[PDB]
Design a protein around this ligand. Sequence first.
Ligand SMILES: C=C[C@](C)(O)CC/C=C(\C)CCC=C(C)C
Length: 287
Amino acid sequence: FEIPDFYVPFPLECNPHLEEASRAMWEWIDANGLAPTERARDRMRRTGADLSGAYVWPRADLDTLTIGLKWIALTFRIDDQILPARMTAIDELRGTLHGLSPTARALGALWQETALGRPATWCDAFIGHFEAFLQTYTTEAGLNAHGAGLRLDDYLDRRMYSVGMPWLWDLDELRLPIFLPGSVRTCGPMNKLRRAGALHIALVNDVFSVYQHNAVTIIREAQGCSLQEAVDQVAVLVEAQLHTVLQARQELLEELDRQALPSRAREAAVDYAANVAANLSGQLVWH
Ligand SMILES: C=C[C@](C)(O)CC/C=C(\C)CCC=C(C)C
């Protein structure tokens, strides 16, 4: 099939601190036994975790980028090492986030470091997004036990979390002049932006990736159409997500005015939303 010529209008941004943050990431990996064999070290090298982070958080300072790369490296290792066996592994990880395996121990320590001195509303948002991400491993294994075709709408509802965007973007708040107020983080336009941006990225990933849990496959198997025809339909969905991102950004500006926020908070919210938009270009280029 012919891969669509995906176009995104937002500038392509990459973090200038990649080389230094990558050395700090690898040092943490080494310290934690997250790549305890050369096989594992080679898989880690080949995943491009560091480059991935430099595209997720292009505007971050070195300290924020470095913490973000630790999360990406950890999640790579969790993914590498992954229905009852999945539930058991996932529940042990989830437990660590509540103070309840070198990978699980690393997660609990990394969470302690991340939460320290960070506001409770942010911590709760990050945990919910991270737990939603982890739970997708169990959801998809459950669905695999069923005979019926997958529903696209339910797939997208889980895919916005399995792509990881939501918790990744939570970490972008660490580089802002202040954390988002709770009334901005979970306002209508921000939720719309977060979902559409996450789905744009994920659906582009699905096209480059095409395991049943893929929008291309789901459409093809439901309709009995050709692979190219299913791809073209996913391209239409992607364009829809783009236009939803564009709309939500405008709507966010209006909502910031309705809240009568301090200038610092308005600025932080606009910068966060520009980063969400940047990621549509960065992650397209990464794929
Ligand atoms: C994941 C989304 C992208 C878009 O494919 C890459 C970003 C970061 C990675 C993979 C770490 C977080 C997510 C997992 C392991 C799939």
